[PDB]
Structures are given as structure tokens and as C-alpha cells.
Amino acid sequence: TTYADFIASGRTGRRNAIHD
Amino acid sequence: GVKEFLAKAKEDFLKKWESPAQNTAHLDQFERIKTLGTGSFGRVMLVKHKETGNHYAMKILDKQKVVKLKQIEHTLNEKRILQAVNFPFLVKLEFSFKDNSNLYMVMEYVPGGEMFSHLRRIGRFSEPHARFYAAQIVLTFEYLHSLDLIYRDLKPENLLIDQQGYIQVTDFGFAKRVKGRTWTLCGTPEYLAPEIILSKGYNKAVDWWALGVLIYEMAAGYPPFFADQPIQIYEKIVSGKVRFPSHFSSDLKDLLRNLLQVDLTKRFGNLKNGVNDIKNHKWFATTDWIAIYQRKVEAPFIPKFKGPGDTSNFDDYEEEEIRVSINEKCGKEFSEF
């Protein structure tokens, strides 16, 4: 499932902004 | 109505934009309690104002780090714009000041936590729940865009839940007053519009794309474009193909197809009818826009509240000493702060 793939991914925690 | 309101709102904003408040408190006036959150640039701490006993949230930026990360003009934008705005869903800046080492922005403390933490824990929001938050962002962008302000970092981490269950937008770090195109690569990867990724000049339409991402993530429980690394995310965004959960209503899918739209001649928010293409869309048909503005709608949920300075709705963070050098850093760069 998409949910399972998201939860197993490396970006489920807080996401900080990017720059440069 | 909204027209007269926005007219007065612009009059009020321009006075503060042209004469910004500066140096309105000092670090020694606050007891520092606990870190509430951190980002790429700043640390935000719960503080208690010694004279009044009020709690606030204080954003601390190290001047030297702001310089290294090429955020000088952005940070000046952030404070100049946040001190000048006034809207029911925008966090209030109460004080700002600087010392030898740091910049400080003392905000109202929004105690219900980030939308992010509630969303991840609960899994996903029902469509009426997502709609209640989305409506507040729609009204907030209508207000910001009318002042020629682009926001540029919509995401659950930057949205706080107040004691009445309403949204407070925080983190004006990429906010900019601009009448034409702008070009800076900034935002958060999952939320970037394709025209940002492709280094085009872009405009306030990128906020409406980001609203599409937010509504999708709220209603699905995951973003429309996700991967393990930003480069992979950017490939998916520029590909532009979105898949929707089976449980998404026909109306929600139609709205999202019009927000997550690569073609700027077709993206809602950007067209001749402006924000009304969104407000009058079928997914929002049950929304009473004045009632939302007036905060008269009963919220989907009310954060737990245990005391004035309770921080239970926030994650714990490693604490770091606030050091203040005996030498002034970056004086010229931040003269106007």
C-alpha cells in the first residue's frame, strides 16, 4: 500500500526547509 | 465586506511596513524554559516574561549561521513582514530584539502543537477536518497575497493548533513582499511547485500549489510526492502525475487536480477569478467563509491543555546553551533588525 511505503520511508519525521 | 476589510488591512499593514518596530524587549526580561521546535535556521523556546508572567515562544537565530546559510535578506524580510501583519490565523509577533550573537523574535505561544504531530499520530484527517484547516489557509493566503506577500513555506510543521483548535501560521522565514516574479530556490521539498524546482521566475501561484500538497497530505496521511531523498521527490513533482487514495471524494480529487496543476494558466488561485475559484469550488460548498474568519465554527478537536506553560503537545528537543559573545557579530548585516 502507499501508506505502508510512506511509513517505511526515510521522510516521515519533521521536514526542515531547504536553501541554496 | 472582504473588499473593504482588505482595503483597511492594507492601510494598516503599509504603516507598519514603512515604520517597523525595533528593539522592543531584551533577553534578560525572559526566563527560558524549554525548546518547542527547531528548523533549518532557528530554535524556538518556551519563555516566560518576568514582568507579566505571560508565556511566549521565542525564535532564536544565530547571526553567524544566518550569514553562512545565505539567509540575511530573508531574515530581515521575516521580521519586517511578521511585525506588520495582522490576521486571525497568523501568529502574532510580540517583541523583537538582538544582541551580540543572536536575533530574537518573541511570538505568542501556540500551545496545541504542530499540525504535523497530530496528523502523523492520528494517521489522516477526515475530509471535513481537513476542510476546516484548509479554509483557514485559503483566507490567510487571500490576506497575504492582497498585501503583495508571498509566503513560500506552507507545511504542517509550520502550522500550529491553538487552544480553540484553530490554525496559527508560523515561520515567515521565506515571506517576501514582491510585485513581480521572484527566483529564490526555497521552501520544503515535498511542497515545492514545479516552477520553483525548474528555476523559473515564479509568483504567488506557488502558495496555491503548496495548499494542494497540504490538503492532499492532510486527507491522505502522506504527501502526493514522497521519496527517501529530495532529488527523487523533485523528479516526481516535475513528472506531475498524482495518484489519489480510493477514499478521496470526487470533489476533493477535482479540487486537487486544479491546485496541483503544472499549467499556470489553469492553476486555481492564479486565474481571472482569483481566490473565488477555490472558495466556490464544490469541495468547499459546506464552508461558511465568514463564520471561519470570525472563529465561530466548532473545531474538529481541541488540544489537551494542562497549564499555561505546559508543552505536552510538543516533542522534546536536546537543549543548547544560548551563548552571547562579548563581541558584536554581523552588526552591519542586521542593522535594521
Ligand SMILES: Nc1ncnc2c1ncn2[C@@H]1O[C@H](COP(=O)(O)OP(=O)(O)OP(=O)(O)O)[C@@H](O)[C@H]1O
Ligand atoms: N509561536 C510558536 N508557538 C509554538 N511553537 C512554535 C511557534 N513558532 C514556531 N514554533 C515551533 O518551532 C519550530 C521551528 O520554528 P520555525 O519553523 O520558525 O523555524 P525554521 O528554522 O524557520 O524552520 P524551517 O526549517 O521550517 O525553515 C516550528 O516548526 C514549531 O514547532
Ligand SMILES: [Mg+2]
Ligand atoms: Mg519551519
Ligand SMILES: [Mg+2]
Ligand atoms: Mg523557516
